[PDB]
């Protein structure tokens, strides 16, 4: 519940996906997500987790905002972000 972006690998060979979260962040860790997508996560989820830190937290904190409840917002940003890539 504590490895960082660099430590926790959750992208495409997501070691954490190997460990709702499973398909949540497989595409939310690609270069697809750029700090404006971070912004969109913070606003549309209505989470101050990403308002305090749009590039600095741990997998615990992203589940802190409920993944299934806020998959609507995160999803819009996710397929958005992949097409943005």
Taking the C-alpha atoms of residue 24 and residue 38, their distance in angstroms, rounded to an integer, is 15
Taking the C-alpha atoms of residue 16 and residue 52, their distance in angstroms, rounded to an integer, is 24
Do residues 47 and 40 make contact, with C-beta atoms less than 8 angstroms apart?
Answer: no
CA-to-CA separations, 18 to 14, 15, 22, 47, in angstroms, rounded: 6, 5, 8, 26
Taking the C-alpha atoms of residue 23 and residue 37, their distance in angstroms, rounded to an integer, is 18
Name the residue among 7, 5, 8, 4 with its Cα closest to residue 16: 8
Helices (H) and strands (E) in the chain, counts: 6, 0
Method used to determine the 3D structure? cryo-EM
Taking the C-alpha atoms of residue 77 and residue 28, their distance in angstroms, rounded to an integer, is 8
């Amino acid at each position: 519940k504590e490895k960082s972006w660099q430590d926790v690998s959750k992208d495409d060979l997501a070691k954490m996906e190997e460990d709702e979260q499973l398909p949540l962040i497989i595409s939310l860790k690609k270069p697809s997500i750029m700090p404006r997508h971070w912004e969109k996560i913070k606003e549309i989820t209505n989470t101050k987790l990403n308002y305090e830190n749009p590039d600095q937290f741990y997998i615990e904190e992203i589940m802190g905002a409920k993944l299934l409840d806020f998959r609507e917002d995160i999803e819009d940003i996710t397929e958005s972000a992949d097409k943005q890539l």
